[PDB]
Design a protein around this ligand. Structure first.
Ligand SMILES: O=c1ccn([C@H]2C[C@H](O)[C@@H](COP(=O)(O)NP(=O)(O)O)O2)c(=O)[nH]1
Ligand SMILES: O=c1ccn([C@H]2C[C@H](O)[C@@H](COP(=O)(O)NP(=O)(O)O)O2)c(=O)[nH]1
Ligand SMILES: [Ca+2]
Ligand SMILES: [Ca+2]
Ligand SMILES: [Ca+2]
Ligand SMILES: [Ca+2]
Lengths: 223, 223
């Protein structure tokens, strides 16, 4: 399972743009080990979406909507890693389907950590794409939506430590589900029209956070 | 750097006792992969004690007192793993001193994750002992104190999901520092008298959480 090369290239361009918002010279400041750490930490967040602890709240239920967000976060970091180092610098060995089985999920997502530490970023990207295919969620649409939230966060003091993620019982991430649900897989991968659908996802996320029109960045900013 | 074999054996006995409080048949219910996951997750907590994120709160300061707690948590899980499988089933390659350097810490603590996934539990234990020696904190006293909090947690609904860790701005873990500060390294490792000092640490932690005298377990319960 893979995305069209043109779609992947566009996702990579968005990722470079976002990385540039965080730091103009990110390509000189960041190293492969940074992306390995970042993926490791998101993978811990992904694992913590499951009731894996045998000693604490043992009847807890998995947060399967959150799984989607954490996989999307991993993609941002695996795209980033791949921009800096090639894998040169197999999947069915590390991923176990169906991921609806919690034991399969825990094993697979721990293996993402192994792959990250090996700096196999392209393989991590493939693993996330395969996971979204297996779980049956719209990875590309989640990416565009979380990409947009990531930019909003930077606009609202994230680097300064003044941003608050959970407000009035709602985490910013949770608002993304509703922003994406109108969009099909074909909407966001159509060769001719995908960019207008990505632009539409972006506008929906800006709306969800009340971003003033003048501060909004459209799809053209990123490509 | 290592502990006396008699001290290590006593720490292992405490650990078995605690594991038994969580489940009477833990030795049949738990598998090596459980302990690998648990250490991985504590190592993420340890890494998150440092200002590693380049995109969020970039001027944050490391929580060096919390580092002590997270290393102690790793020890509980590495002791546990070692009870189930041997390493048969080197350190200077994986740990980088001094750990006061944040780059050394991030590299080292990520390598603890690699060792956990390899089920090298004894090596993880050695790494924690070496880390406490390098940082200069009283690992054995931290272990006894956190061991006691772990038992209190189980008494107060931890498995049921009714426990609250942070109350009136104070995390339960933070109260342990004051419980241990009177105790020297020699106090808690003295061949003849260490058990009375461990018992004293326990009584201090029970006091810190107001545990009724009848619910308190003394050192003899565990050895
Ligand atoms: O140079 C960077 C730094 C961060 N991120 C994004 C990717 C990921 O989607 C998000 C993770 O941010 P976080 O601060 O860990 N918060 P959360 O996991 O709740 O989204 O940050 C980037 O895309 N590039
Ligand atoms: O079978 C078990 C399960 C847990 N723990 C202990 C070890 C560790 O000290 C603690 C971690 O608990 P947690 O629920 O992750 N909470 P925190 O990391 O804040 O202490 O649980 C055990 O000793 N044995
Ligand atoms: Ca995160
Ligand atoms: Ca996340
Ligand atoms: Ca923990
Ligand atoms: Ca911990």
């Amino acid at each position: 399972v893979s995305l069209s090369p043109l779609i992947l290239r566009s996702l990579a361009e968005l990722q470079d743009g976002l990385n540039t918002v965080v730091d103009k010279n990110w390509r000189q400041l960041r190293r492969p080990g940074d992306w390995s750490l970042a993926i490791t930490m998101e993978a811990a967040e992904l694992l913590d979406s499951y009731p894996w602890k045998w000693w604490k709240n043992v009847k807890a239920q998995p947060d399967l909507q959150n799984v989607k967000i954490e996989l999307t976060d991993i993609l941002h970091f695996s795209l980033s890693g791949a921009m800096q180092v090639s894998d040169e610098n197999d999947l069915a060995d590390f991923m176990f389907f169906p991921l609806s089985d919690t034991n399969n999920a825990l094993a697979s997502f721990q293996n993402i950590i192994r792959l990250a530490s090996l700096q196999r970023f392209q393989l991590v990207t493939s693993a996330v794409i395969a996971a979204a295919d297996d779980i049956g969620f719209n990875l590309v649409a989640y990416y565009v939506a979380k990409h947009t939230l990531n930019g909003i966060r930077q606009m609202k003091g994230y680097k300064d430590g003044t941003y608050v993620k959970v407000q009035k019982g709602v985490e910013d991430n949770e608002l993304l589900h509703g922003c994406i649900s109108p969009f099909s897989l074909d909407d966001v991968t159509n060769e001719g029209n995908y960019k207008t659908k990505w632009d539409d996802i972006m506008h929906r996320v800006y709306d969800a956070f009340g971003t003033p029109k003048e501060e909004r960045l459209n799809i053209g900013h990123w490509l």
